[PDB]
Amino acid sequence: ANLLTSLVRAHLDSGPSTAKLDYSKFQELVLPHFGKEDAGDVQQFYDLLSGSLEVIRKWAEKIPGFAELSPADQDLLLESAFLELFILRLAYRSKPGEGKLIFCSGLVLHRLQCARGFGDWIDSILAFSRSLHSLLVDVPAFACLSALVLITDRHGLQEPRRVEELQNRIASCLKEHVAAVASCLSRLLGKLPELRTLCTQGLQRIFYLKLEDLVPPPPIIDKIFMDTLPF
Amino acid sequence: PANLLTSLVRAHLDSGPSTAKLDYSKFQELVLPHFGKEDAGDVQQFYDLLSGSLEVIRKWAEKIPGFAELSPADQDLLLESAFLELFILRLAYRSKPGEGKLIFCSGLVLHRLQCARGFGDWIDSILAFSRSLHSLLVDVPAFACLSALVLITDRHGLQEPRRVEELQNRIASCLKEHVAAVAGASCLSRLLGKLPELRTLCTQGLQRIFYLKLEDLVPPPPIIDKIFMDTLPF
Numbered sequence: 232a233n234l235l236t237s238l239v240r241a242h243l244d245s246g247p248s249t250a251k252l253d254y255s256k257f258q259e260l261v262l263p264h265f266g267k268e269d270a271g272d273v274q275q276f277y278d279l280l281s282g283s284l285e286v287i288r289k290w291a292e293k294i295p296g297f298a299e300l301s302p303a304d305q306d307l308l309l310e311s312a313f314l315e316l317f318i319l320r321l322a323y324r325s326k327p328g329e330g331k332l333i334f335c336s337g338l339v340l341h342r343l344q345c346a347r348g349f350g351d352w353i354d355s356i357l358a359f360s361r362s363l364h365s366l367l368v369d370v371p372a373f374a375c376l377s378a379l380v381l382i383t384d385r386h387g388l389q390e391p392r393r394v395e396e397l398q399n400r401i402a403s404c405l406k407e408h409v410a411a412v413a414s415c416l417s418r419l420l421g422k423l424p425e426l427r428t429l430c431t432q433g434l435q436r437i438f439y440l441k442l443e444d445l446v447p448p449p450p451i452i453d454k455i456f457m458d459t460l461p462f
Numbered sequence: 463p464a465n466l467l468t469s470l471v472r473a474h475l476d477s478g479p480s481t482a483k484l485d486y487s488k489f490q491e492l493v494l495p496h497f498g499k500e501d502a503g504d505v506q507q508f509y510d511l512l513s514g515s516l517e518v519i520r521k522w523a524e525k526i527p528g529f530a531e532l533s534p535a536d537q538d539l540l541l542e543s544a545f546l547e548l549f550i551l552r553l554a555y556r557s558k559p560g561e562g563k564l565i566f567c568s569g570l571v572l573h574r575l576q577c578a579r580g581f582g583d584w585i586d587s588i589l590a591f592s593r594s595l596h597s598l599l600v601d602v603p604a605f606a607c608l609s610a611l612v613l614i615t616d617r618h619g620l621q622e623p624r625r626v627e628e629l630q631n632r633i634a635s636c637l638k639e640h641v642a643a644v645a646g647a648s649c650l651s652r653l654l655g656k657l658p659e660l661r662t663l664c665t666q667g668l669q670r671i672f673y674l675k676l677e678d679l680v681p682p683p684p685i686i687d688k689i690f691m692d693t694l695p696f
């Protein structure tokens with residue numbers, strides 16, 4: 232009902248439409264990947280993880296009843312879920328037939344201009360990408376899935392039962408939508424385990440980039456990292 | 463007889479395995495590990511192959527002249543700062559890359575595939591490094607000196623750093639005295655040409671332990687955890 236529509240509203244307002252792209256730096260050619268990753272790839276990596284914070288935030292608040300959660304609760308769910316959301320929305324938004332990563336701002340890059348920036352991670356992104364595109368998830372269901380991933384418990388919640396009351400309401404609307412158009416639905420959900428795997432890949436890379444320390448993370452990345460660390 | 467080298471190599475051999483007293487009671491040159499994942503046994507066994515890597519490097523570091531006579535806060539710092547860089551090196555030389563056998567300080571022998579689940583892709587790099595090592599065929603005395611200079615070096619925090627700098631020089635004199643009694647400089651330069659391939663195994667090592675601290679099947683022993691914690695510049 233209104234939930235299905237209020238989620239597709241917030242969703243399409245967080246990504247670029249078919250019309251609103253910008254190829255203003257796209258070259259399907261990359262000159263010799265000299266040595267390995269230089270500071271140019273590291274700071275680009277940080278500026279493209281920076282270019283999804285504001286987007287995933289407004290996308291979160293324009294979802295029914297997200298703002299009605301405590302100031303501290305909204306912060307932790309968003310911090311702990313950022314990486315996965317960033318990934319999810321990027322993979323589904325991309326093109327793995329030609330190798331095109333399309334970002335939530337509207338800019339498009341070829342996988343080779345990312346390779347030095349992101350590391351092995353990106354392939355597991357493409358591998359999950361087509362695996363999503365083979366499922367051909369429809370926009371309303373994807374607007375719901377994006378929410379479902381964010382609307383999930385992070386250790387420390389003040390009102391975990393209230394977060395739980397919203398998820399089963401969102402998950403029921405996907406089950407009801409997929410039934411309005413159950414093994415398909417389980418094949419839908421079964422991607423989040425591969426997602427919670429790809430996140431760890433993301434952290435595996437950032438550990439070695441703060442280590443390497445060509446360029447240091449933006450401060451708020453520094454935060455999310457430290458705060459999502461179990462140690 | 464160059465008695466620093468005579469009194470030094472003693473510590474080395476007495477900290478390494480002697481052919482006859484290796485351990486074959488666990489070796490399987492073949493094993494089918496479900497690649498991609500690894501259970502607590504592989505991890506706690508990996509952890510108990512590194513907890514003991516510190517006590518052996520411990521019972522190899524006491525026998526370093528002027529090291530037991532360093533402020534206990536200093537001795538702990540160099541052992542922790544070099545532990546991982548030391549572990550990879552000693553493993554590579556006594557290992558057998560052309561057989562498929564990692565021979566540890568405690569005389570234990572395993573097959574690459576038995577480490578596959580426990581260790582992961584990292585260990586392949588180790589083997590790849592042993593190969594690069596053995597092709598140079600570095601002799602026993604010169605190696606005994608190198609592992610020390612990886613330990614006896616300027617780290618961040620030293621209380622009495624000028625002392626550590628005098629011991630560094632004291633180790634180099636006995637190596638330079640030995641490099642002249644062999645050719646009676648060159649090999650030293652060829653060797654350093656793969657020290658980046660050593661600092662690489664360090665970084666990969668940290669990342670491996672990072673991933674299993676993420677995984678937290680078994681919690682790391684606090685001693686290694688501490689080495690980890692303070693080896694981070696953040």
Ligand SMILES: CCCCCCCC(=O)c1c(O)cc(O)cc1CC(=O)OCC
Nearest residue numbers: 267350351352432435436582583584669
């Ligand atoms: C699973 C244990 C490691 C096996 C080797 C895979 C290559 C690697 O070193 C690595 C990583 O471990 C995590 C990452 O996010 C990215 C990379 C690749 C890398 O550094 O870019 C090129 C040098």
